[PDB]
Design a protein around this ligand. Structure first.
Ligand SMILES: CCCCCCCC(=O)O
Ligand SMILES: CCCCCCCC(=O)O
Ligand SMILES: CCCCCCCC(=O)O
Length: 582
């Protein structure tokens, strides 16, 4: 009451409050030293403590955003570090906070993290334990500005547990790396997923996220009722709206209340929440988010009875045009848990479009009667793409699959920057190994729900510097139809070739000197540059010359002595390739 900061301090705590203010400061001022953030966080914590001590103290009844802005832009006084943000500290709410959000750079130019030796790491661990963790939050926060803040509190706890367990024992080295590598890969997949849920709210509206929540939650919690699912959807969309416009303190407090509410009414929602509701406070929210699908209730009546075979559908749509679509998306999703939540959204849009021209054109019950018959092509389009691409996967392997995708997507949009083309085709090829092990029933909810994440990275790294017109149209036209837009483009007849640059195909030394995971990029980028050299005369057997590149390495990889072999076979290879016209 009368003080939001005091209420947040009382609710969250003292250790969860200082952590959430370090994340908020680091996600806004990405290029700032650690000590500055520590000082600001300490000052904010002291101010909050004083406001808790006396509610009618010096001014602290102001909204959290106002205090954030006052400590952020009126105190930092660094304009050469962040250009044009000096003019940002000139407006009022809600203009200043909106201004701050466009400057969160998704791909900052910061040095890549290098992991020190285990001995030094655990030596520094048992000296300033309270600071060693605070450095972990700072780096992950600044490199991933849209990371899910209450989730990042969980990763810090797992990091601390991992350090406490292993190197306070024998075999310090080969205990930590197998565990820390699990968090690094799990931390780069929960940041791309949250970016998608957060770019669907500030670009496509709250009506787009609410439908996604209704479709997703109804799959995972059947045998519930629309009254319960609507409440859960409203609470969830309130939670996820606050983690996007920087209200981390209010986002972490609302998530805990939602988890508590779900655990209280466990029986009315799902029968698989017994285990997740007996965990600590930070682990309940993670367990509930990844709970498995509940068993479908038996004896569900066919959906055609009261959606196409009832003489009130037009009246029901006229009465309210979003609660009827909510019911259709809820009923068609609880009984189809083998569909991706983006395919279900597409069918709901098709039903709405059919009803729009049928509830206001002559006889209603003559044109929407066969609406369910036109759902078949939409259903069969992605399952014929998963069955084919995943068949291509288990005859080439991961590395050779990423190359096939790389050539396919370079000819579709031969104007995106090479680092983006390489980095998005490497992520696309990892869906072929992530869930091709699943049976056919579980393939679609995993593949198409992962591709939608990856393609999002192609759009948020392209909004900053729009170069290709096709990518702009596919990204900014519809959220659900973003994947069918991409997998429908033929080879671009425009984009006259890039001409010949000799220095690109001039591999000099190295290569067989560093890790396999990183030396692969230095060859995939060469392949990308090769494709953009001849977009049109690029028939499949021509890229067998790609194998020759490997050969050009192989010999010199074992003949590293007389390193001039790199140049010799390089000029030989480029002469032979140019003589081959492809
Ligand atoms: C407290 C965690 C909230 C879980 C409800 C649904 C989560 C999701 O589907 O993302
Ligand atoms: C692309 C959105 C399709 C579903 C519209 C209704 C959403 C809701 O239930 O609020
Ligand atoms: C099993 C993975 C299937 C999809 C791979 C990527 C298809 C595409 O977007 O062209």
């Amino acid at each position: 009451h009368k003080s939001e900061v005091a209420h947040r301090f009382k609710d969250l705590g003292e250790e969860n409050f200082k952590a959430l203010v370090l994340i908020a400061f680091a996600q806004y001022l990405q290029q700032c030293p650690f000590e500055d953030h520590v000082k600001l966080v300490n000052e904010v914590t002291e101010f909050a403590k004083t406001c808790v001590a006396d509610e009618s103290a010096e001014n602290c009844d102001k909204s959290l955003h106002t205090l954030f802005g006052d400590k952020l832009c009126t105190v930092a006084t660094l304009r050469e570090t962040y250009g044009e943000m000096a003019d940002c500290c000139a407006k009022q709410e809600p203009e200043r906070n909106e201004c701050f959000l466009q400057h969160k750079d998704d791909n900052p130019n910061l040095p890549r993290l290098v992991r020190p030796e285990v001995d030094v790491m655990c030596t520094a661990f048992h000296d300033n334990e309270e600071t060693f963790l605070k450095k972990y939050l700072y780096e992950i926060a600044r490199r991933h500005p849209y990371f899910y803040a209450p989730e990042l509190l969980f990763f810090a706890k797992r990091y601390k547990a991992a350090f406490t367990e292993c190197c306070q024992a024998a075999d310090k080295a080969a205990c930590l790396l197998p565990k820390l590598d699990e968090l690094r890969d799990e931390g780069k997949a929960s940041s791309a997923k949250q970016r998608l849920k957060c770019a669907s709210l500030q670009k496509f509206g709250e009506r787009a996220f609410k439908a996604w929540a209704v479709a997703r939650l109804s799959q995972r919690f059947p045998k519930a009722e629309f009254a319960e699912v609507s409440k859960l959807v409203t609470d969830l969309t309130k939670v996820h709206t606050e983690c996007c416009h920087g209200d981390l303190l209010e986002c972490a407090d609302d998530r805990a209340d939602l988890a508590k509410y779900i655990c209280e009414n466990q029986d009315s929602i799902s029968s698989k929440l017994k285990e997740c509701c007996e965990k600590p406070l930070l682990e309940k929210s993670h367990c509930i988010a990844e709970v498995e699908n509940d068993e479908m209730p038996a004896d569900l009546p066919s959906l055609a009875a009261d959606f196409v075979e009832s003489k009130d559908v037009c009246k029901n749509y006229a009465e309210a045009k979003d609660v009827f679509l909510g019911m259709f998306l809820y009923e068609y999703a609880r009984r189809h848990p083998d569909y991706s939540v983006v395919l279900l959204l597409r069918l709901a849009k098709t039903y709405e479009t059919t009803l729009e021209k049928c509830c206001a054109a002559a006889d209603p019950h003559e044109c929407y009667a066969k609406v369910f018959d036109e759902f078949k092509p939409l259903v069969e389009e992605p399952q014929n793409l998963i069955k084919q691409n995943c068949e291509l996967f288990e005859q080439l392997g991961e590395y050779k699959f990423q190359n096939a995708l790389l050539v396919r997507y370079t000819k579709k949009v031969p104007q995106v920057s090479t680092p983006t083309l390489v980095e998005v085709s490497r992520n696309l090829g990892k869906v072929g190994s992530k869930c091709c092990k699943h049976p056919e029933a579980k393939r679609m909810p995993c593949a198409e729900d992962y591709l939608s994440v990856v393609l999002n990275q192609l759009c948020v790294l392209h909004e900053k510097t729009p170069v290709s017109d096709r990518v702009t149209k596919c990204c900014t036209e519809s959220l659900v139809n973003r994947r069918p837009c991409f997998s429908a483009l033929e080879v671009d007849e425009t984009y006259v070739p890039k001409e010949f640059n000799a220095e690109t195909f001039t591999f000099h030394a190295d290569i067989c000197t560093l890790s396999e995971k990183e030396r692969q990029i230095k060859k995939q980028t060469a392949l990308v540059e090769l494709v953009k050299h001849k977009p049109k005369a690029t028939k499949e057997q021509l890229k067998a010359v790609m194998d020759d590149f490997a050969a050009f390495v192989e010999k010199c990889c074992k003949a590293d002595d007389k390193e001039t072999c790199f140049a010799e076979e390089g000029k030989k290879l480029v002469a032979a390739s140019q003589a081959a016209l492809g």
